[PDB]
């Protein structure tokens, strides 16, 4: 039975269809089997669903399923948003295919300093949904794929990662990388002395 999550929309009729058909309403994207929405948006729920490779479907999926009397396959209902695909420069279908082949952040260990925006806990949810490790405190040693997402306010606290050669990165490394399902840390390095 599906555990359906909604994002960027309000659809009481859709929620009712999920339950009527035997499914349940997902508490979060990490728990969801399907995400229902109307557009591509950079939200914790959308980015987590995409990172996990679950179906991201239109609101018509549930309404047509209710008419059928059972959950229909996802294929004919994938969210299509050429406009936002143009705004962001990526293909949702291609990004999902990538997520379905591999977790984007497999092997990555990421510490997000306290002052970063968006909020560290939201960044960690996204990191975890992409198979990475959200670190509890600043690292003390170098390791490949171990990085620190930080910000100007926190540069004063970055002497240890700089000492050991850990990259200081922009939060967009995560947001843009997860949206496109393409991790390019070298392209988001911050300049702490500027």
Swiss-Prot record:
Residue span(s) of domain BRCT: 1-79, 100-191
Post-translational modification remark: Phosphorylated upon exposure to ionizing radiation (IR), ultraviolet radiation (UV), and hydroxyurea (HU). Phosphorylation in response to IR requires ATM, NBN, and possibly CHEK2. Also phosphorylated during the G2/M phase of the cell cycle and during activation of the mitotic spindle checkpoint.
Source superkingdom: Eukaryota
Omega-N-methylarginine carried by residues: 52
Known tissue expression: Highly expressed in testis.
Localization annotation: Nucleus; Chromosome
Coiled-coil region(s): none
Domain notes: Tandemly repeated BRCT domains are characteristic of proteins involved in DNA damage signaling. In MDC1, these repeats are required for localization to chromatin which flanks sites of DNA damage marked by 'Ser-139' phosphorylation of H2AX.
Quaternary structure and interacting proteins, as annotated: Homodimer. Interacts with H2AX, which requires phosphorylation of H2AX on 'Ser-139'. Interacts with the MRN complex, composed of MRE11, RAD50, and NBN. Interacts with CHEK2, which requires ATM-mediated phosphorylation of 'Thr-68' within the FHA domain of CHEK2. Interacts constitutively with the BRCA1-BARD1 complex, SMC1A and TP53BP1. Interacts with ATM and FANCD2, and these interactions are reduced upon DNA damage. Also interacts with the PRKDC complex, composed of XRCC6/KU70, XRCC5/KU80 and PRKDC/XRCC7.
Function: Histone reader protein required for checkpoint-mediated cell cycle arrest in response to DNA damage within both the S phase and G2/M phases of the cell cycle. Specifically recognizes and binds histone H2AX phosphorylated at 'Ser-139', a marker of DNA damage, serving as a scaffold for the recruitment of DNA repair and signal transduction proteins to discrete foci of DNA damage sites. Also required for downstream events subsequent to the recruitment of these proteins. These include phosphorylation and activation of the ATM, CHEK1 and CHEK2 kinases, and stabilization of TP53/p53 and apoptosis.
Name recorded for this polypeptide: Mediator of DNA damage checkpoint protein 1
GN (gene name): MDC1
Full-protein interval shown: 1892 to 2085 of 2089
